[PDB]
Design a protein around this ligand. Structure first.
Ligand SMILES: Nc1ncnc2c1ncn2[C@@H]1O[C@H](COP(=O)(O)OP(=O)(O)OP(=O)(O)O)[C@@H](O)[C@H]1O
Ligand SMILES: [Mg+2]
Length: 288
């Protein structure tokens, strides 16, 4: 075809990602082979360009197969986090990454585009200290199946509680929740809420942040999947949840994990939090 397959980077919810070379340009790209309303909405993402969004270069619809051609980056944050686990990611780099991802979300949210499935494998990094949001807008266009293309289990670890409770019309707040979970994991070096079922995911959230009620989340007891029989756990201290982190960091995280999505901090407001007063742009040491 037009591309030389270099390797198979991975497999995910919708399809398989290849590293490939454009035989005509020499451009090295990521090619996602997937497996309509979806066509126009994916194609619209070609216009959603920002330095912290993986660039969607082209969409190809042929013989009932869908190909997305993406900017290639050499590593994802899950691999970087595993690689950094003995020592931890230094806080100035955690802060730079969080700041850049908040700029990306602020851009997307201002254009009324949700990610809805943020996770470490959807965050890509380069040698220059940049981090980029990948697969932005794909879930709205394809739905989110319960199992992935190759059999694999869908990760619930970063899912906002309003989604778990069956809210049909969730908002940009769901991306802030996910990024909060990722922030905490980068600090502690273990996932904050590693649920292995939807109810385990929910109850893990409840056992840390307390079972929500009408005081802290007006409307919660009327959500579709809310049950009065939910156990009532007390809330824990964030100093216990992400211990090493300073009070600026814990303050910001608490605002990104607010239960009530209407009160959860926006990306734009998060960028102004005092946590970022000394933000810089360090480079990671990447071994490629
Ligand atoms: N543009 C890209 N450049 C480099 N690697 C990429 C790129 N896009 C995806 N990858 C990597 O390829 C692998 C497969 O990605 P894929 O999107 O299919 O799965 P995922 O991110 O785990 O899940 P999901 O399908 O829900 O997005 C992952 O490790 C991902 O980080
Ligand atoms: Mg992905």
């Amino acid at each position: 075809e037009n591309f030389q397959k270099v390797e198979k980077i991975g497999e995910g919810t919708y399809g398989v990602v290849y590293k490939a070379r454009n035989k005509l340009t020499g451009e090295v790209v990521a090619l996602k082979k997937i497996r309509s309303t979806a066509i126009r909405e994916i194609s619209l993402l070609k216009e959603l360009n920002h330095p912290n969004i993986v660039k969607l270069l082209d969409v190809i619809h042929t013989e009932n197969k869908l190909y997305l051609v993406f900017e290639f980056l050499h590593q994802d944050l899950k691999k970087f986090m595993d690689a950094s686990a003995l020592t931890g990611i230094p806080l100035p780099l955690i802060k730079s990454y969080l700041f850049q991802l908040l700029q990306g979300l602020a851009f997307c949210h201002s254009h009324r585009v949700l990610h809805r499935d943020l996770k470490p494998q959807n965050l890509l990094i380069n040698t220059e200290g940049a981090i980029k949001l990948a697969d932005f807008g794909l879930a709205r266009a394809f739905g989110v199946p319960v199992r992935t293309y190759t059999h694999e289990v869908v990760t619930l670890w970063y899912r906002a509680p309003e989604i778990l409770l069956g809210c049909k019309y969730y908002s940009t707040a769901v991306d802030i929740w996910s990024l909060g979970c990722i922030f905490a994991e980068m600090v502690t070096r273990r996932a904050l809420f590693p649920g292995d079922s939807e109810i385990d995911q929910l109850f893990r959230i409840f056992r840390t942040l307390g079972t929500p009620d009408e005081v802290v989340w007006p409307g919660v007891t009327s959500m579709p999947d809310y049950k009065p029989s939910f156990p009532k756990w007390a809330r824990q201290d964030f100093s216990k949840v992400v211990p090493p982190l300073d009070e600026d960091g814990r303050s910001l995280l608490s605002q990104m994990l607010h239960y009530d999505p209407n009160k959860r901090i926006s990306a734009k407001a998060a960028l102004a939090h005092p946590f970022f007063q000394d933000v810089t742009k360090p480079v990671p040491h990447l071994r490629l």
